[PDB]
Amino acid sequence: DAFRLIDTGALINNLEPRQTTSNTGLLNKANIQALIHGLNRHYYSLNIDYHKTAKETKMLMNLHKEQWQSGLKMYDYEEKEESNLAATKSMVKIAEQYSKRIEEEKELTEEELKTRYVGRQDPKKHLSETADETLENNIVSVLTAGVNSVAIK
Amino acid sequence: ILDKIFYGVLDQGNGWLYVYETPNQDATYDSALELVGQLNKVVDQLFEKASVLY
Amino acid sequence: TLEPSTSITLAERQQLAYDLSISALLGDKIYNFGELLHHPIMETIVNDSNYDWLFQLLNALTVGDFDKFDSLIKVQISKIPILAQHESFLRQKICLMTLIETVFVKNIRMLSFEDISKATHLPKDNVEHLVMRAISLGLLKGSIDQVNELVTISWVQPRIISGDQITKMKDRLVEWNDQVEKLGKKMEARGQSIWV
Amino acid sequence: MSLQHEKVTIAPLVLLSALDHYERTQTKENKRCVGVILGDANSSTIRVTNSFALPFEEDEKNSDVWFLDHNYIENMNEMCKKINAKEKLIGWYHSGPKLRASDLKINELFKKYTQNNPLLLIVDVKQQGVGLPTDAYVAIEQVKDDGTSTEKTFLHLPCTIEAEEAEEIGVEHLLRDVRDQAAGGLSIRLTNQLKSLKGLQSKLKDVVEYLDKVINKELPINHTILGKLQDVFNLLPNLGNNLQKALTVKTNDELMVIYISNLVRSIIAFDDLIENKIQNKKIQEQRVKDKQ
Amino acid sequence: SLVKLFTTNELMRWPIVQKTYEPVLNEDDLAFGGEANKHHWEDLQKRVIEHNLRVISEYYSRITLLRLNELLDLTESQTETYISDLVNQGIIYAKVNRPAKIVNFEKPKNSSQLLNEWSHNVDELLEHIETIGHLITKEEIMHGL
């Protein structure tokens, strides 16, 4: 946010240089702590409008463009099995915790469930997160394997 | 062989003692089966919870 | 790294080319003479007949001729005792030349003891040591099999590519690129609902 | 001599300064624009961080009529050192569109100012490209591919655009209208896969075109390129047998894992539906018995 | 020359070594230098046989027993004893087939190894195609001038 000093004795007129001929300046709201140091007392605030250009915004996109030779690169086919086995074991444990959760939920009152899973692993969002993450990783692995097996040959 | 010390198979052809590497029994399927059992139990508990809805 | 300011004596450079040919023939980690033959260094004796015998022998080496090689080596074994000392090494070079050229012509990732024996003139019992030398020197990366003579071949030492080979490689490129384009078109058409 | 040319990292500020430079000096067609690429080096990954304008001049004539001010480099060096002593000259960049004749010649002028081998950075300032518009070219001496005198020429390096904390904030703010911040994980990975496939197709078409040119002898015969192509063919695996069976068994296992995960997702949805129905029934009862 | 013999991946004949380098080795002290050094010659024979096996297993895959005895020069049963000892220590992967008189020096490849090799080959192919693409433009500039 830019600033520019108040004039001087225009406070005698009390008309700090601000003619509200448009709403475009009044939309911005002065900060709280900024007024503590004095905002409308010594330097009327200004507006800030970053103006872009088609060339610049087109091509700053390149910061999130991966290398072309990385999409078809399958990673080592041992980690993709250890990860699956670990995810399956975690799924088994989380399902057991889900069973005990459902068992315990029968005799709990809402004033506790509103704060029950604050400090302990909620064994439902973990299950959904593990399922979604492993399914996404697995689908990507399948598609990469098949695509390279067909196109590369 | 019956005690599974070496995973060979004895034969009565002429006195041969074929020796085979240990089997694999991949852990993924065992984990999947325990998961399936746990999800079965979860299904029964969830339907029991749905009795109040009915 | 030679410079055009001076090319010293033509006779001395001819002798240098002669020595280079001798060393290439008697060098261990050299198994393709194409670089020397089509280099300007060979222009010094590209016409002279005094050292034409070794040029013919080098051409036979590259082609793989046996009887012509035998006659030439018999006649010129007395030209220098240095070549006479390493005649067995030269014969092993002939055998390796024949093996490499037969692998590159007949293709086939597998082979047989009988084919190598016929194409290298060695008995079917010495082919094994021949491939031992070939693998150790880095020409191939295969693996032997003696119970059934089925020598297996993998990546082979590269060779300078001629004009004809370009057309076949270009056509294979065209086919591969067309396959890739078809796969990409199918992939784009099938999943246009999520490509954002 | 340092071998530091393995990886190149560019902050977006250098590149945007390049674009600003090109749009500022009103460079028309065929007029290249050149500046310096201040950054940090002596590590394996050369990193470009800041740039500035240079008074480079050249007539579209004999390649040796190129002109460049010598005092300007040191004069900028002193001020930039005063601002920050951690940014040292590591070469130069030109405003594309592709390598020119004088690139090898002018690079030697920056040899004394630079400490390591000067770095060339091609910038596709007018944006004809599709991939990254930046590539590095370190001048090194290696034997000729035609069996002739060793030549000191340029070598391409893998350049990746990466930002630091200071510049990532600005980049994320500036393009905070076109980037799809929702996107989704699997969808963005699949889009990356398709983009990589299209890039492979484009490079294959370029190689095919170059071979078509070389068979007509518009270009000479390079045995290194042909050898690399033959190696590419040799490395091409044959699938359509033992590898086929291994791939099939892995795919089957992987699909079974996918099946398990989908089952888990379905049961989670089941619990969500049950809980939501319970809460809806409770809300209906609440409204009914409080209205009455 | 002796160092060259025990560094090159090439099988050597035991009698050739035992009759070629034997005089120079014998005229010495400490090692191979008298009756008390007879303890060393057996060790040298064992080492050369071990080197022969380490080369053959690196090259061969289905060596038959008769030719294996020919190469190692071990009589008939010392060959099987040696193979047994070296595999028991864990240097080489070997498996005998006495009724068929075959030796399977190759190690069967698990699916993980196969797919890792395929992935590495595909990665090398992609890297090489990138290098070709980036050299094509350089040479086009060089000879388009």
UniProtKB/Swiss-Prot annotation, chain A:
What's a single GO CC term here? cytosol
Briefly state the modifications made to the protein after translation: N-acetylated by NAT3.
Can you supply a Gene Ontology BP term from the record? Answer: proteasome-mediated ubiquitin-dependent protein catabolic process
Molecular-function annotations in GO: cysteine-type deubiquitinase activity; metal ion binding; metal-dependent deubiquitinase activity; metallopeptidase activity; proteasome binding
This protein's UniProt keywords: Acetylation, Hydrolase, Metal-binding, Metalloprotease, Protease, Proteasome, Thiol protease, Ubl conjugation pathway, Zinc
Catalysed reactions, as listed in the record:
Thiol-dependent hydrolysis of ester, thioester, amide, peptide and isopeptide bonds formed by the C-terminal Gly of ubiquitin (a 76-residue protein attached to proteins as an intracellular targeting signal)
Asked whether the UniProt record includes Nuclease among its keywords, one would answer no
Q: Write the Enzyme Commission number(s) for this entry.
A: 3.4.19.12
Keyword Hydrolase on entry: yes
Query: EC top class, in one word?
Result: hydrolase
- How does the entry describe the domains? The JAMM motif is required for the deubiquitination and degradation of ubiquitinated substrates.
Give the similarity note: Belongs to the peptidase M67A family.
- Quote the subunit structure annotation: Component of the lid subcomplex of the 19S proteasome regulatory particle complex (also named PA700 complex). The 26S proteasome consists of a 20S proteasome core and two 19S regulatory subunits. Interacts directly with RPN8 and STS1.
Protein purpose: Component of the lid subcomplex of the 26S proteasome, a multiprotein complex involved in the ATP-dependent degradation of ubiquitinated proteins. RPN11 is the only catalytically active member of the lid and serves as the essential deubiquitinase of the proteasome.
What part of the full protein is here? Answer: 154 to 306 of 306
UniProtKB/Swiss-Prot annotation, chain B:
**Modification note:** N-acetylated by NAT1.
- What top-level branch of life does the organism fall under? Eukaryota
Assembly and partners are described as:
Component of the lid subcomplex of the 19S proteasome regulatory particle complex (also named PA700 complex). The 26S proteasome consists of a 20S proteasome core and two 19S regulatory subunits.
Family statement drawn from the similarity comment of this UniProt entry: Belongs to the proteasome subunit S9 family.
What's the further remark here? Present with 16800 molecules/cell in log phase SD medium.
According to its UniProt entry, the function of this protein is described as:
Component of the lid subcomplex of the 26S proteasome, a multiprotein complex involved in the ATP-dependent degradation of ubiquitinated proteins. In the complex, RPN6 is required for proteasome assembly.
UniProt name for this protein: 26S proteasome regulatory subunit RPN6
Gene of this entry: RPN6
Q: State start and end of the fragment within the whole protein.
A: 381 to 434 of 434
UniProtKB/Swiss-Prot annotation, chain C:
Domain PCI, chain residue ranges per copy = 1-158
- What residue ranges are annotated as transmembrane? none
Q: Any extra remark in the record? A: Present with 12400 molecules/cell in log phase SD medium.
User: What is this protein for, i.e. what is its function?
Assistant: Acts as a regulatory subunit of the 26S proteasome which is involved in the ATP-dependent degradation of ubiquitinated proteins.
Provide the family line: Belongs to the proteasome subunit S11 family.
Name recorded for this polypeptide: 26S proteasome regulatory subunit RPN9
Organism (species): Saccharomyces cerevisiae (strain ATCC 204508 / S288c) (Baker's yeast)
Swiss-Prot record, chain E:
List GO terms (cellular component aspect): COP9 signalosome; cytoplasm; proteasome complex; proteasome regulatory particle, lid subcomplex; proteasome storage granule
Q: Does the keyword Metal-binding apply?
A: no
Residue stretches in coiled coil: none
Arranged from A to Z, the UniProt key words for this protein are:
Acetylation, Proteasome
Q: List the disulfide bonds.
A: none
Q: Where is the PCI domain?
A: 1-110
GO terms under biological process? proteasome-mediated ubiquitin-dependent protein catabolic process; protein deneddylation
Entry comment on modification after translation: N-acetylated by NAT1.
Q: Which family does it belong to?
A: Belongs to the proteasome subunit p55 family.
Q: What else is known?
A: Present with 5710 molecules/cell in log phase SD medium.
Role this protein plays: Acts as a regulatory subunit of the 26S proteasome which is involved in the ATP-dependent degradation of ubiquitinated proteins.
UniProt protein name: 26S proteasome regulatory subunit RPN5
Which organism does this sequence originate in? Saccharomyces cerevisiae (strain ATCC 204508 / S288c)
Lineage, uppermost ranks: Eukaryota, Fungi, Dikarya, Ascomycota, Saccharomycotina
Say which residues of the entire protein are included here: 298 to 442 of 445
